[PDB]
Amino acid sequence: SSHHHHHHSSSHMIALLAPGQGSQTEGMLSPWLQLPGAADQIAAWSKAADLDLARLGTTASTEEITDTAVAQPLIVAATLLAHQELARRCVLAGKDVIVAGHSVGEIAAYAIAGVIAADDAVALAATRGAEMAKACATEPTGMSAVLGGDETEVLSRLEQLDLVPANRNAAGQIVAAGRLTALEKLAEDPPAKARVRALGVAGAFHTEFMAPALDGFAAAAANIATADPTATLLSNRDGKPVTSAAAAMDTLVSQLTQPVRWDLCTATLREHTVTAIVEFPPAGTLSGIAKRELRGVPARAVKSPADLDELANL
């Protein structure tokens, strides 16, 4: 984390995207682990996070990975190992860099933007999941995706049923969150010309039902070294860039019970003339959204190291 601001001789802008939850795959660390330096870092982080990462990345079932307490650090683990190699390759030399993470991915984005250290981030993702899981055992809650019709109609409807728009990802892409009974009521009758799919998650993330998780998350968030960003770093709260480290960490914490306004992140990306987009593993969804919402901007979904190759020039 020490650098020289590149010279422009007399746009060169790349989005880096860090994935959220709900796309972690059975074999998601295999392509990265056999690379030099990765095993060492993982044992270090696995011990640092106090959960077994090396095993849970290779021969682990999707089911034991869909467990927020495991899922969260594991996603972040994969994102950083992937970025770590991208940096190492020097592919981004002389590019203006903008970074945004989804939901959990903010922890990984913060690390990519050099606000927190790689190891600390994983440890904080472990706390996030562990604390969030406790909160889920309070009241039967969940989240259900709403692939949508009329934006006004869909917002009016979650109000009636007392559910939060927990993710606002795209135009017509809303996640609803709250009590399982209220979500069943959403499913039982949706607002016309729209669909509902109960995402398999253990609680209603990014809603007020995460209060109990707040203190536990804030405690680790505070005990962590910090630095002012080395990239334009976006925040899920409003999609504005974050200037100071203190600000970022404040937002990150309070983002636990607030809507993920990823749509407004996509808006900020447009007004930067991003030339290309890189999603990190487990990549897929965020690049999908960017293909649809950001016309004519190339986007790559990193799954294996072989993908970081045709980026040498962009």
Swiss-Prot record:
BP-aspect Gene Ontology terms: fatty acid biosynthetic process
In the UniProt entry, which residues are flagged as the active site? 103, 206
Task: Name the pathway it acts in.
Answer: Lipid metabolism; fatty acid biosynthesis
Post-translationally, this protein is described as follows, namely:
Pupylated at Lys-185 by the prokaryotic ubiquitin-like protein Pup, which leads to its degradation by the proteasome.
Catalysed reaction(s) here are: holo-[ACP] + malonyl-CoA = malonyl-[ACP] + CoA
Which superkingdom is the protein from? Answer: Bacteria
Q: Name one Pfam family in it.
A: Acyl_transf_1
Q: Does the keyword Cytoplasm apply?
A: no
Q: What is its EC number?
A: 2.3.1.39
Cellular component terms (Gene Ontology)? cytosol; fatty acid synthase complex
Crosslinked residue numbers (Isoglutamyl lysine isopeptide (Lys-Gln) (interchain with Q-Cter in protein Pup)): 185
Q: Which UniProt keywords apply?
A: Acyltransferase, Fatty acid biosynthesis, Fatty acid metabolism, Isopeptide bond, Lipid biosynthesis, Lipid metabolism, Transferase, Ubl conjugation
GO molecular function, one example? [acyl-carrier-protein] S-malonyltransferase activity
Q: Which InterPro entries match?
A: Ac_transferase_dom_sf (IPR001227), Acyl_transferase_dom (IPR014043), Acyl_Trfase/lysoPLipase (IPR016035), Mal-CoA-ACP_Trans/PKS_FabD (IPR050858), Malonyl_transacylase_ACP-bd (IPR016036)
The regions listed as transmembrane in this protein's record are none
Q: Remarks, anything else?
A: Was identified as a natural substrate of the M.tuberculosis proteasome. Was identified as a high-confidence drug target.
- Family the UniProt entry places it in: Belongs to the FabD family.
Name of the featured protein: Malonyl CoA-acyl carrier protein transacylase
Q: Which organism is it from?
A: Mycobacterium tuberculosis (strain ATCC 25618 / H37Rv)
Organism placement in taxonomy: Bacteria, Bacillati, Actinomycetota, Actinomycetes, Mycobacteriales
